[PDB]
Symmetry: C3
């Protein structure tokens, strides 16, 4: 039971930025490039005989067709076991926020297809993860990121979530907390996702908040941020139109509020010539801040993806 | 239809340089090393069902048995389609000048087996390529190298060639032009190759010229260069003697033309124990310039190559 | 006859150091981390038809599940041939001292599982190796490490050993000499290993000495070191207890000998769920020097290893 797998997707990005300059000016420009969209390669397997138990391992890395890259196992790679009790695994592994993540499936490039600012804390760390099996559509998992920090007060972080799916219907909580980080102190991220996922239709609303203690010097400082996003995919024959909106908020206080708010949106589709082979078309838009000091950006492109 | 493939070739290089010296100067020396000769690995495939169309993808990278290396998809790797209309493909891809290139098949190392100075503009860039199918021995292709440069005046470059083969007979034009480059404004490279390739015999003469505008500070400055090369390979049983000459002429300008001319030559053979497994033996020689300030170099070695 | 193979092993390391101090100094601390234990990936093969001869090639590289890594063929990778006469092979290849090495099979991490200081000269160099076939349990091999050094007086090194195995019984001499090194003029390393290896029991004693000329200013300067180690492994059902001791002696010369001596030991086991899948447990201890300026360290951990 050895398997070699992966996916290759690439194509062109036409992109533009409008940098404001309301106060003290200039507005930069289009960049148009050939870009490998998240391409990558993996090997992996499982063994039995063995028992009710099975051994699982994987090694996956970034394979850029464009070859802007380097390295091994910078993808999700691990070793672990699954059994009556589910899977325990270790090594480079996905954030519990990273594996909700289903509401943000935009094949993308050096500049965001979308929806990014909301997916900023979706990571891979060298860590440990338990994922409990299903019971009545129920699931849960937990993750430790020791690395490493003792040493000082621990920058190890802490990850877990649960997932319900009942009849094409779902919600997923994912959360992260961090005992310490420099250029920060104990930091928290929370996400709930819910929607229908099934039969040629998908819709989801997700909400993430992050509450953070701050300024290890100039205490007590702190910030909160909040983001919403929503996505509707659908399908027929081979085409799969999809759309997403994301509004992040700013925060308050610190002595000053402003509005650090952002809005962004994406639409595009997929045309399956086959299961594996899908043509991709994508157009996003985003705006940071508002008024005289502010920002806008607009991306679009095509791409191919062949999964194997 | 997945495939893993590649080739491994390595072996020893004995090398020497004679650096010419009106003194204050000196003549450097032999270096003798174990060297991986162009060794590398690849995966790739194609899909149908599908249609008259097929999906092609490849990921190939430098695999040094000597491991002086790093990375992924720094070989020719891509994604594209073939069909009635031929192949369109994208990602890291070979120059049109790089895919004539048949006249220079000397497995080589850190220093020049040969024939190098004439193969200097044979590249791989992240780009787009169309290769039209065969009609009556006829073929053609085109390539865009956007990356990236707008930004400023575009350093994107431009590549295409055609190929005729009739009855073990061939000619290949390949050409490159560059809208911009820092230290060469608007630069051009042209190559014609012709010869017999077939049935245990190969002979070819190829000619490349490069005409270049020069902005360095320099307006109006400019240079031309020209290179000829010729190669005769032949075969029996398992041995495949081969030989190559290359004479470049000078960059001609600046009130002393001088002579920047160079001459170089290579001979060696191949002994197939099988299709895949061939023992390689090679000796080159080169000379740059002439007279009191000048250069000479002499290389030779063995190696093995097993293709898979 | 192509083969993809490798092994994945990872897990946790709890570690501690006691650094001895009149102070300026102090006694440092535990570090506890998830660590990929020597994990890695390879491809390779052989061909015939061919003859009594066969072609062998391999490309193996470090694959860290933890992905602290980079690169290709930094493992043992080569090309060569085997036949009546045995194997000649080239490329990145294992030191003759490296392939005795059977007495030190502790899956390990960034800090030593064990037994390290004795395995310090077990290497891979870009080089050439002949390994003669078996005759009456007899074997031999020789290695040249040219790279590269002429240039100056040659830092190429020199490697060979022999191996006897008769009825679960063995001894292996491995030796290394180096014509030059900056940090060693003309350096030598010798190892004998002997023991029973067979049928669920393994025991070995090995001895290494290294005699070295020292050029720095110092002529004539020089040092000798000596190290002993011993290992007992055994097996039942699926568990495989093992233990190892290593005592190095000092460099002794130059009017003050001191004692640069060190002692270290390791114990732990393996539990095969299968041939491939083994759970690993390990505890080592080491001490450098003695007295008021000195050192101690203690490591322990678990890990999984799945070979493929
Ligand atoms: N660090 C990263 N940088 C860029 N893109 C990423 C990163 N992490 C994840 N991605 C993108 O997220 C996608 C995950 O979606 P998909 O379901 O296709 O794969 P996946 O489930 O992550 O695969 P695996 O389970 O092996 O990680 C990847 O294909 C990749 O395009
Ligand atoms: N960066 C490089 N510069 C010059 N020559 C190279 C370079 N990389 C590879 N080569 C050599 O060019 C030779 C061309 O031979 P070959 O046709 O087998 O490969 P290729 O056509 O480039 O590969 P592909 O099947 O991916 O198109 C190869 O043997 C390879 O070792
Ligand atoms: N640079 C290194 N640092 C630490 N440990 C290493 C290093 N190189 C090899 N090892 C360990 O030594 C062990 C050697 O055992 P093994 O026989 O499996 O490999 P090998 O013989 O070196 O490779 P090959 O199968 O290609 O001959 C490996 O398990 C490996 O993890
Ligand atoms: Mg994807």
């Amino acid at each position: 039971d050895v398997t070699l797998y992966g996916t290759i997707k690439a194509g062109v990005e036409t992109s533009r930025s409008v940098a404001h300059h309301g106060a003290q000016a200039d507005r930069v420009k289009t960049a148009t490039e050939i870009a490998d969209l998240g391409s990558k390669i993996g090997f992996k397997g499982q063994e039995d005989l063995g028992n009710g138990l099975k051994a699982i391992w994987q090694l996956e890395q970034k394979a850029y067709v464009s070859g802007t890259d380097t390295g091994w196992g910078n993808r999700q790679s691990f070793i672990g076991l699954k059994g009556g009790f589910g899977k325990v695994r270790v090594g480079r592994l996905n954030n519990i926020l990273k594996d909700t993540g289903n509401f943000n499936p935009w094949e993308g490039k050096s500049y965001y297809s979308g929806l990014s600012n909301i997916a900023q804390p979706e990571e891979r760390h060298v860590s440990v993860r338990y994922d409990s099996p299903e019971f009545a559509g129920f699931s849960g998992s937990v993750q430790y990121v020791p690395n490493d920090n003792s040493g000082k007060n621990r920058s190890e972080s802490y990850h877990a979530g649960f997932n319900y799916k009942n009849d094409g219907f779902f919600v997923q909580y994912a959360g992260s907390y961090k005992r310490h980080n420099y250029t920060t102190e104990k930091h928290q991220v929370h996400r709930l996702v819910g929607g229908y996922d099934h039969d040629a239709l998908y819709a989801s609303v997700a909400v993430q908040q992050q509450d953070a203690k701050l300024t290890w010097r100039d205490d007590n400082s702190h910030n909160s941020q909040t983001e919403v996003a929503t996505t509707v995919a659908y399908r027929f024959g081979n085409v799969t139109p999809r759309v997403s909106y994301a509004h992040g908020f700013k925060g308050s206080v610190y002595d000053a509020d402003h509005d650090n708010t952002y809005d962004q949106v994406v639409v595009g589709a997929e045309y399956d010539f086959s299961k594996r082979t899908s043509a991709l078309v994508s157009a996003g838009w985003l705006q940071k801040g508002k008024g005289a000091e502010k920002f806008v950006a607009t991306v679009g492109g095509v791409g191919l993806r062949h999964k194997f």
